[PDB]
Structure formats: structure tokens, C-alpha cells
Design a binder for this molecule. Structure first.
Ligand SMILES: Nc1nc2c(ncn2[C@@H]2O[C@H](COP(=O)(O)O)[C@@H](O)[C@H]2O)c(=O)[nH]1
Lengths: 180, 180
């Protein structure tokens, strides 16, 4: 089912936002076609982390992941960082060829930073380009403010709705901000 | 002079692709207004690096920076990374207030990472938003290919020419790819 036009959408949770101090604890992927139609949904993987890493999280993160249950899921997981990377790679490979899709989503420079340090082979499977929806949001804010203020932010507390809300944010801009 | 909706455009040259292992050897900036009108061109600075750093560059960067003149300009530079940062901030300070502008250019996630590592005072001067022209390049190649070819890009290896082309690539999308 491969197709170099298909897009790889990704969302990550981390113990914090610094790739040197922090680690990935959840990953999720969704492959669309070039026109934002879902082809398939990757695994949502909580990635095992030892207790020292888990206790080493700052205050805001310790609360947010604990109350979400991600901490407990991460504590129980038998899937390592490398194993999750391979699981996501095994899935992405039947839909998108190597170095074809950019990373798609929101705030995905930070995602590329973490993939670079912690999953270098998955980072390498993307085209080096970034499809970041917030570029369009930033342009809409300046040049067509009504299109951005008209977007209906969804719930996104779970990883696949999070990605789907980003895909729907691109749709909104394709429909109301992009002459085609 | 200052105006919080002015945009800071930046292009770097590096010794390699790792923002943490490699270094910055050239930088330039251009300030436009929020409608892509060039307000001012910042200085083009070659940054001195020890000879070992230049000899250690891979094959592509040895070729490319050798034949552009940059390798020789690096060797002959007496401007350290920090002085190039202070010189660029001195210019940008006249045109954009602190934290107002995103970082604008092509694949500027790579640029921000190098700045974050090597020029964190300059990185901190940008709004946290990334204004990535190549996000639109990928959307245009997928949703309206013949506006992606309407755009004439001279293979411009002078730093300011690379930036002016980036500003012109976004102009071409505001006109032919975006509805306002
Ligand atoms: N190793 C390597 N680096 C590249 C390549 N293309 C661009 N770069 C890096 O990108 C920098 C310039 O960014 P650009 O303007 O090409 O986005 C160069 O200084 C170099 O470090 C490449 O094909 N191989």
C-alpha cells in the first residue's frame, strides 16, 4: 500500500521538553493520503521507563502524566524505546517509503529533536522536511485572522484524537485558507 | 523603528547536520514587515572555526563550502560565534522587539536547533513559533503542483540571495497559493 505521497503524522509525550534531560514515554502515528484521508492508524505505545527517570520529571510533568495515567502505563510497559521505534517503523513501512514523508503535525520541530536523540532510525525514515500546521496558523493569524479564530479546537487528551485534531486543523486551512 | 509584527528571516551554513556535534560557519538575516516587504538586510558573517573543524567536514560539505569561498572565509574570519551573535542581535534589535517574530526561512527547524545550541541568546530573541516556507512547499507540491513550478529559484549560494529567495518563495504562495 506504499505511496511516496502519503503523510506520516506523529504525536509524542515526553517526561519534559529537553532531549538531553528527558525521554519519550508515548508515541502515536497516523498515515494519511496526500489529501488528509486516513489510510491507517499506528500503534499507540507507552514506552517503558525506569523509576529514576520517572521520579526525575519536574513538577508540571509529574502531575500531568500521573493524572493522565501515562506514568502508570509507562511503569507497566514492557516495550522499550528501541522496541517502540521498531513497532512504529514496522507499521509506517507498509504505507510510506523511506525519506518520502515529512514529519506532519503541530510543534513537530520539538518532536524531531526527540526522535533525533532517542529514535534516530525513525527520525531518518522521514524526509528531512517538516509539515508544521502552525506555519499556516501563524500566516492565518497575520493575513486572514477570521480563518484561524474560526477553528474548533477538539479534545486531544488521547494520542490518536490529538493527531486527528491536527489533521483536521490542516483540513480547515486547506478548505478556508488555500486556493486550489 | 521597532515593530512587533516585523519578521526575522535567517539562513545559516553549518559544518554538518548535527546541531550538537557540528557548528555554525555562516549566518545572515533580513527583516521584512508582516507583508514580506524588505525593511533591512543584516550583516553576512563568516564565523571562524579551527582548521581541524574544516578538515573534519564530510565530503559534501568539504566540496560545497570549499567552492563557495566559505571555507576560506571561515579560516580568515576573526569573528567568533559569540561576536557574530552579538552583531546579529545588534542589527535585529533596531527592527523587531524581543520575542515578537517567529524564525522565518526554509526548513528553519534545523536553523533554530543550531542557534539554540550555539547562539542561545539569539535563539531566545525569536518567538517560539517557526514560520517554515517549506511546509507550504510540500503542500503546494501535493495540492497545486503548478504553483510549485510557477516559481523561479536561482541557484543562489550567497547568503543574502538564499534569504531573498526564501522571502520570494513565500510571496509566491501568498499570491498564488493562499486565499485572503
Ligand atoms: N551533510 C550534508 N549537509 C547538508 C546537505 N545539504 C545541506 N546541508 C547542510 O545544510 C546547510 C545549509 O542549509 P540549507 O540552506 O541547504 O538548508 C549546510 O551548511 C550543510 O551543513 C547535504 O546534502 N549533506
Amino acid at each position: 500500500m506504499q505511496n511516496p505521497q502519503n503523510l506520516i503524522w506523529i504525536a509524542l509525550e515526553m517526561t519534559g521538553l529537553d532531549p538531553d534531560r528527558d525521554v519519550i514515554i508515548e508515541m502515536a502515528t497516523i498515515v494519511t493520503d496526500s489529501d488528509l484521508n486516513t489510510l491507517a492508524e499506528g500503534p499507540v505505545i507507552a514506552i517503558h521507563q525506569p523509576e529514576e527517570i520517572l521520579a526525575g520529571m519536574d513538577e508540571w510533568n509529574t502531575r500531568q502524566h500521573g493524572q493522565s495515567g501515562l506514568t502508570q502505563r509507562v511503569r507497566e510497559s514492557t516495550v522499550s524505546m528501541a522496541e517502540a521505534e521498531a513497532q512504529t517503523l514496522a507499521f509506517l513501512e507498509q504505507w510510506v517509503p523511506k525519506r518520502s514523508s515529512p514529519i506532519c503535525g503541530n510543534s513537530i520541530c520539538q518532536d524531531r529533536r526527540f526522535l533525533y536523540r532517542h529514535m534516530p532510525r525513525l527520525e531518518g525514515y522521514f524526509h528531512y522536511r517538516n509539515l508544521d500546521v502552525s506555519t499556516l496558523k501563524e500566516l492565518a493569524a497575520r493575513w486572514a485572522p477570521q480563518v484561524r479564530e474560526s477553528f474548533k479546537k477538539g479534545n486531544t487528551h488521547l494520542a490518536l484524537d490529538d493527531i486527528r485534531e491536527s489533521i483536521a486543523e490542516l483540513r480547515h486551512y486547506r478548505d478556508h485558507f488555500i486556493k486550489l
